[PDB]
Structures are given as structure tokens and as C-alpha cells.
Amino acid sequence: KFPRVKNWELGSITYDTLCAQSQQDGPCTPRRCLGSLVLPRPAEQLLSQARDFINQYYSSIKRSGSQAHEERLQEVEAEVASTGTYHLRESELVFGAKQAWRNAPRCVGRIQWGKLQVFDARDCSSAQEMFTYICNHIKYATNRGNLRSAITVFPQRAPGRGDFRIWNSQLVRYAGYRQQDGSVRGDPANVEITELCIQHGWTPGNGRFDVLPLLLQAPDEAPELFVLPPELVLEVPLEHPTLEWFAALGLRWYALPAVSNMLLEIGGLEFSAAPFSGWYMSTEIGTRNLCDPHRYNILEDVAVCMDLDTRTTSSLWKDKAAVEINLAVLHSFQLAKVTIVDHHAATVSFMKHLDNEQKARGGCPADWAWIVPPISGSLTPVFHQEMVNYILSPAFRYQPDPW
Amino acid sequence: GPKFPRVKNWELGSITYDTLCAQSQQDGPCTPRRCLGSLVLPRPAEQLLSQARDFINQYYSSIKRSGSQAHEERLQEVEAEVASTGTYHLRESELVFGAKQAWRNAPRCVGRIQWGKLQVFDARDCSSAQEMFTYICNHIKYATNRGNLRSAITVFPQRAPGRGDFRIWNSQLVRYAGYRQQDGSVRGDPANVEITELCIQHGWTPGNGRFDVLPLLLQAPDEAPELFVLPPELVLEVPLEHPTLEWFAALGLRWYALPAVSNMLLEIGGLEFSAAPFSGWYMSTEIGTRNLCDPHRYNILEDVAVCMDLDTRTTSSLWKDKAAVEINLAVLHSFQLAKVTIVDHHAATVSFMKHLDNEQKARGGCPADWAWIVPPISGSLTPVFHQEMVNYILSPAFRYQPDPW
Ligand code: HEM
Ligand code: HEM
Ligand SMILES: CCN(CCc1ccc(NC(=N)c2cccs2)cc1)Cc1cccc(NC(=N)c2cccs2)c1
Ligand SMILES: CCN(CCc1ccc(NC(=N)c2cccs2)cc1)Cc1cccc(NC(=N)c2cccs2)c1
Ligand SMILES: C[C@H](O)[C@H](O)[C@H]1CNc2nc(N)[nH]c(=O)c2N1
Ligand SMILES: C[C@H](O)[C@H](O)[C@H]1CNc2nc(N)[nH]c(=O)c2N1
Ligand SMILES: [Zn+2]
């Protein structure tokens, strides 16, 4: 049955019919809902995903049923039948990557989905070559602060060999040094990748914001270390518009969010290295990366500097310091002329995206827990919006760490 | 290893498995194809008897006499009663256990650390609307307790074959009127426009303030509902002021002390208690964020931001977030000064994490609805944001039921 989806702020109702196109089960059953969980627990097969994807592509260019369309299905069928796999055309890759982004339930920035620079790096044959492509991507996407969404697609997985992989989770990550007494200097999210880099020969620094080298792996070979040229990594020193001491914290963040550990699936084909980037929403830095207790955890230091009463939850010291930290992020990115979006503007644009998608496809897969921001939830319109979560393909998926 | 949902806390890195979810006899709204966890309201003798047996088994376990002669006699008692009457009745101690178990079972409630501390008023002898009113007044007096709030539920007679239901028409025992204006806007609380107009259709003379307490519309079986005005001195309110912003008091904002939900159905062993109002105390974000700042509620964010001299013309000033924080602080400071029990969202969520741990050991899981448990401001500043949760329906339960009109 198609779900009724209600907006509680405005009282309007839509029906999601797009969900009938989901050929892939999520974690929930009628007995229990597992929607808040972060992670999940042959020829005819590939051939049906492939045909379905070819159909999606030709439909998008309005040329369904054409000679072009029928001949491409035969190509795909001939290639699978003989070889057990096939290959996308550049234009199909481009359509498939944009559609994977369109389809991502956890992304609040999908209003932008049509505007994606696609770099084809399927002719890559060494870690060395991956490095060059990654540098060009960083260069293109950063654009001196006028950030532009981009994805670089490396060669697909193949039955008879190891995957191309970027070991780092982002192209830009700060090091995390474990002390002999369990504590962390830097970003505790990155302790494990930091130790991998050292163990593969990297000379470590000892500051709070040391940029990591990349560990890049060509099929069935040990990964290789590649330091990014400092000029390629744009960073933003953080200051506050009115609190002078805030700059004295020595806080900074990188401009470019570039996810490099997800698998891109198109038409049954899987791209194990396909790093993508856009721009940040301020709460990702301001709230999560700087205030999570298991991240940089700076809320207490900011509260002391602000002279808040830290001894009781009911002074709302956490809330006040978080807000100022998020304001600092926005102010500093704006001063540095680096693209960023606040959570109000971002969620307003997502509401427009939902409406666009309702008209265009009869629904939009969205994961409420990830779309609603991590401060000021009900102050944004997405909090009051019901949403339906399901897996469409093309898709960005999680995959195992390669070590 | 374990064939049960794996539940992770991403802050602490710890893992549990929910085995309680196996005791669920009732489907939620989700399927393998699509998750509907974010939807607010997604859409016979042997049936009764099996619900009844299960509940009686739950009761006897709770007092550690599973399989005893007292247990097998009670089962026989219940089937005999259903056999001859089509229904059955709860012993007093069974009603008490079942009302606490329903609270304990409520996936949307963050206050469940307190579940064992509930005063159960048994009003199953009530036979008129006038008498419901007396019971409700007594409930309010007990629960309010001059500011030192005490959790309580009052249980009216269960649904009976043919005979009409006891119903309270109001969604809460205390609600502010919402008066639709000529210009199409609302004075008072827009959530209550419908109950306000029903009160007027039923003979209430309306006021015209922003905070007029509504009368109760109480319905006894097969009768038109009757109207009762709460004695003003029974409805404790808290005027709002801010600890440092001296002008906030000039806004004339207020909220009532006692949140008492009155339109939910309490189901125990298949029995249906259609009138069963319950009350605890507020978490401060219900007032300061949702009630006062929702755009479809009092919607005061812009007014407060203007008094704070914020830049309301641009989202990136964070004017909304700063105003909301101060409004929340005013709510906490004002309740505190008035000595009325309230809990802030940090203290509530921390205590809910303790609840989760207690329930892991006691029952092997805790049904919880993440979207409702995470507070509406400062989500990820609370420990519940980082905690995975498995949502499912256990019984006894508090359920939604259609409006009586
Ligand atoms: C253009 C600006 C964009 C903004 C502001 C944005 C915003 C976000 C945010 C805030 C998240 C949640 C991230 C987190 O909590 O860690 C996210 C998730 C995601 N976005 Fe975007 N997005 C943008 C562009 C893109 C692009 C270009 C892609 C891919 C081509 C993409 C795909 C994703 C995916 C796959 C996720 C989910 C990651 C996961 O499940 O762990 N987004 N987006
Ligand atoms: C002891 C103090 C308590 C606190 C701080 C508290 C907190 C809350 C909060 C914040 C909500 C969400 C309300 C909303 O967003 O509108 C809630 C929901 C709920 N609580 Fe409590 N709770 C308390 C006691 C109780 C008691 C005594 C009961 C019943 C015996 C109860 C049963 C419920 C139920 C059934 C819901 C779900 C409402 C719905 O789905 O519409 N809680 N609780
Ligand atoms: C895949 C990693 N995401 C973050 C991805 C991400 C997506 C988007 C952004 N932000 C952006 N604005 C953009 C990035 C790229 C385009 S826009 C930032 C990060 C978080 C995540 C999801 C699921 C599981 C995990 N896993 C973990 N946290 C683990 C730690 C140790 C073992 S597993 C992490
Ligand atoms: C049943 C009403 N709940 C809120 C109940 C509630 C529970 C708890 C509290 N707060 C408390 N702290 C307590 C109250 C009692 C004990 S603790 C306040 C309110 C909200 C809700 C949920 C689902 C649907 C609706 N209904 C609707 N909004 C509508 C339907 C049709 C038109 S409007 C309302
Ligand atoms: C347990 C819970 O699902 C988890 O903390 C989620 C909640 N919402 C999120 N939302 C976003 N955007 N990013 C996240 O990492 C998370 N974490
Ligand atoms: C659409 C969404 O489910 C809805 O706005 C929910 C979200 N979480 C909530 N959480 C609580 N505690 N109370 C609510 O009314 C809601 N509303
Ligand atoms: Zn679900």
C-alpha cells in the first residue's frame, strides 16, 4: 500500500508511489522498525539490474523504445552472456552518478542533484594514476572557495581481482594520535586511518589539525602513501563575529567535504572507488565534528570562555555554546569566501526538492533522522515533514574497510 | 551471532541485542520495502482470550508465580468469565501492574525512568459525567501537589458490549483556547481551535485572551458530553520570565504546570479503557520549543528575536536558534523559581539512557521511537541522538483512538 505522507506544519498530504520501484529490502519488518540504525546487518540477476538501468537512461533522454534503446539492450545482453559483466558508456555513467545522488535518502542537499561534474577515471591502472585524478578533482571542486560538486569514478569491481580503493574515509581528514593513556590528540574519528598511514611509512605530526596523506590501492597491491600538496587543501581559520577570544581557540576546518569510502552502484555494476564532493552544511562542522563527545568535543572549553555555569544542565550552557560555535563556522566561511550552507537554508531547499520530486517521480526517499539537523530540529521545516525511506538504484552504498 | 536486532551506541561504541522485540504480537507500519518510522499516525471471544491469557501470564511473572496454582486458577477464572459474558474484569492489582506496564511500553515517552512510580486511581465505579469531573479534580489536586508534581493515572470504566464509552473530549485536562479571528489568524493556541469551537457549540461562553483555560467536555455512556469549568485555583500556571533579559516578563507569556493527556486509550489484556487520563511533569522543550515556537503553535520566535535585536532577515544569523535557547532557558528558570517540577532535555535524555540500561538487563530491550525521544532543539548535544533504537508495539499499551465526534 502506498504511504500517505503528511506535513504537520501545513496540514498537506501526498502519497508516495515511487516506493513501488524499490527492488531492495531495507532493515525494517512489520514486527520492528530499525530506521535509526546507521549500518545494515549470477547472470540473470545482473542482467535485470542492467536492463532496468538502460531503461531508466533512455527514458531520461526521452528516447524509450528507439533503435538506439533496443540496440543498447542487445549490446548489454551480448556482453553479459559472453563475459558475465558489461561496461557503461560515459553518458550512462554520468546519468547514473547523478541518479545515485538523487536517490540518497540521507542527503539534505539533493536540490543540487542535477549539477554534478562527473570525472571518468575508469582508464586508471595504478595508485599513482588515482593520485593524479584525485588532485585534479580537489583542484576542480575547490575552485578557490567557490565550491563545485564533483565525482571521480575509478574502474569498476571485476570478478577475478581485488578492488580499486581509497583507504581514507574522506580525501581531507585530520590525524588522530592515540596517547599511551587512551586519550586522543586531533580527530578521534581518524585514529585507525592515522595509525595505518604511519605503519605504511608516513612521518606523523603532532598537532590537532594535521592533514592526512592518502592511502590509495590498485587491485591486489599494498596501498601506497601520497601526501597532498598543502596548496590543494583549502582551510578556514575559525573566528566569531563578536567574541574576540574565539579565534584564540586555534580552531580550523577544511573547505572540501569529499567522501571516498562509499560504493557507487549503477545497473548492477559497482564502483568501489568513486569519491564525491559538494560543500558543507554548517552544522556538520559546528555541531557534530567540533561538539560530538567522541569527536573534537570543544563544548566545555567554549562554555568556560563564555563564562557559562557549567555545573548544571539547566543553564543550557551546552546549547548556548553550540550556537556560538555554529555561528563562528558560518561567519568564518563567509569571511574566507568559501561556500557553505546553514541548516535553515539547507532544509528550506530540501522542502522544495521534495515538492519537485513529488511532481517528477511521485515521491522522494528520505531518512528523517539524517535530514533533520543536529541542533534546532523543530525550528527547521523538515522536522514537521513525514518521510518514507527506501532504497532505489543507482545507489551510494556502504562497503567494508579494505584492511 | 545473535538472531536479534543489533543495537549500537555510536558515542560509546557499545553493542546490545534486543530480544524483547520477540514478545511483540502486533505489526508496526514498516516493511522490508519501506520504512515508515517517521509517520506520526501510520494507518471476538478467542481473540480476547489470548490477549487476556498473555496479560495474566505477564502479571504472574511480575510477581514470580508463573505456573503456580494461583496463576492457573486466575486463567480459568478469566476464560469462565469470557465464556459466559463475552468479557472479563481486572483485579485491582492487575490494573495497577498493567497501567505501569503500558507506560513502560510507550516507545515515544522519554520519561520512562519513572515508570515504576505511578499512582493508579481506580475509577471503574464511575457512573456519570458529574462523577468523572470529581475524579478528574481529585486527580489534578493530587498530581499538582502545589508544584511538587506526582505521576498519576485515573482509570474509568472499560469499553462494554453495545454500551457507549466513557470519553474525555479534550486532548489534555489543561488546554488554552484557540479563537479563529476574522482575518483568519488564531488568538490563543491554534492546536485547540476545534475543541474550543466544540466547547462553544456545547454552551461555553468563550473568553478572548491568549491563555484562556478550556472547560472539560466529559461524556458518560450513551449521553451527550457535559461541560465542566475547572476551578481556577486548581489549575497551577507559571508566568514566564528570563533570568537576565528583563523585558521577557513584559511579554506576558505563561504555561500550565500539569501535562495530563486525556484522549488516549489504555489497552490491557484486550480490555479497552477509553477514558484513562494520565499526567507526569513537563520536559522543558515541550513548552519552550514546540508549544511556544512551532510555527503552527504560539509561533513567538520572531517576536523574541526582535526583542533580542537579532538579524531576522537572514537565516545565517542563527536568530531562530538563539531566540529558542533563551525561550527554553526562560521556561526552566521560571518553573524553578515557581518551584514547579520540570526537567530539562539534557537531564531527561541522560536519565532515559539509564532507563535503556535498566531495561536491557530486566527484559532484554526497550521499544523506542528515536524521532520522538531525541529533543527538538540540540539533538546531538544529548546522548540519545547517538543511540540506535528498535521501535515495536508491546501490550499493555497507550494507543491513539478516533475523536468521539
Ligand atoms: C552540494 C552540496 C551538498 C550538501 C550541502 C550536502 C549535504 C549533506 C549532508 C549534511 C549529509 C549528511 C552528512 C553527515 O551527517 O555526515 C549528506 C549525506 C550524503 N550526501 Fe550530500 N550534500 C551535498 C552534495 C552531495 C553530493 C554531490 C553527493 C554525491 C554526488 C551527495 C551524496 C550524499 C550521500 C551519499 C550522503 C549519505 C552519506 C552516508 O550515508 O553516510 N551529496 N549530504
Ligand atoms: C514523569 C514525567 C514524564 C516526562 C518528563 C515525560 C516525557 C514525555 C515526553 C516529552 C513525551 C513526548 C510528548 C510530545 O512530544 O508531545 C512523552 C510521551 C508520552 N509519555 Fe511521557 N513523560 C513522563 C511521564 C509519563 C507518564 C506518567 C505516562 C503515562 C502513565 C507517560 C506516557 C507517555 C505516552 C503514552 C506518550 C506518547 C504520546 C503520543 O504518542 O502522542 N509519560 N513523555
Ligand atoms: C560514509 C561516512 N559517513 C559520513 C559521510 C559524509 C557524507 C556527506 C558529508 N558532507 C557533505 N556535505 C558532503 C560530502 C560529499 C558531498 S557533500 C560528510 C560525510 C558517516 C558514516 C555513516 C555510516 C557508517 C559510518 N561508520 C563509522 N562511523 C565507523 C567508525 C568505525 C567503524 S565504522 C560512518
Ligand atoms: C496524543 C497527543 N500527543 C501528545 C501527547 C503528550 C504526551 C506527553 C506530554 N508531555 C508530558 N510530559 C506528559 C503528559 C502526561 C504524562 S507526561 C504532552 C503531550 C501528540 C499527538 C500524537 C499523534 C497525533 C496527534 N494528533 C494530532 N495532532 C491531530 C490529528 C488530526 C488533526 S490534529 C497528536
Ligand atoms: C543512532 C542515530 O541513527 C545516529 O546517531 C544518526 C542520527 N542522525 C544523523 N544524521 C546525520 N545527518 N548524520 C549522522 O551521522 C547521524 N547519526
Ligand atoms: C514528522 C515527524 O514525525 C513529527 O514532526 C514528529 C517528530 N518528533 C516528535 N517528537 C516528539 N517528542 N513529539 C512530536 O510531536 C514529534 N513530532
Ligand atoms: Zn522502519
Curated annotation (Swiss-Prot), chain B:
Heme b binds at C109, Y400. Zn(2+) binds at C30, C35. GO terms for molecular function: calmodulin binding; flavin adenine dinucleotide binding; FMN binding; heme binding; metal ion binding; NADP binding; nitric-oxide synthase activity. GO terms for biological process: arginine catabolic process; blood coagulation; cellular response to laminar fluid shear stress; mitochondrion organization; negative regulation of blood pressure; negative regulation of extrinsic apoptotic signaling pathway via death domain receptors; negative regulation of leukocyte cell-cell adhesion; nitric oxide biosynthetic process. It is found in: Cell membrane; Membrane, Caveola; Cytoplasm, Cytoskeleton; Golgi apparatus. Residues 34-405 are annotated as: Interaction with NOSIP. (6R)-L-erythro-5,6,7,8-tetrahydrobiopterin binds at S38, A371, W372, F385. It comes from the Eukaryota. Its main location: membrane. GO terms for cellular component: caveola; cytoskeleton; cytosol; Golgi apparatus; nucleus; plasma membrane. Keywords: Blood coagulation, Calcium, Calmodulin-binding, Cell membrane, Cytoplasm, Cytoskeleton, FAD, Flavoprotein, FMN, Golgi apparatus, Heme, Hemostasis, Iron, Lipoprotein, Membrane, Metal-binding, Myristate, NADP, Oxidoreductase, Palmitate, Phosphoprotein, Zinc. Transmembrane segments: none annotated. L-arginine binds at Q172, W281, Y282, E286, N291. Homodimer. Interacts with NOSIP and NOSTRIN. Interacts with HSP90AB1. Forms a complex with ASL, ASS1 and SLC7A1; the complex regulates cell-autonomous L-arginine synthesis and citrulline recycling while channeling extracellular L-arginine to nitric oxide synthesis pathway. Produces nitric oxide (NO) which is implicated in vascular smooth muscle relaxation through a cGMP-mediated signal transduction pathway. NO mediates vascular endothelial growth factor (VEGF)-induced angiogenesis in coronary vessels and promotes blood clotting through the activation of platelets. Belongs to the NOS family. This is Nitric oxide synthase 3.
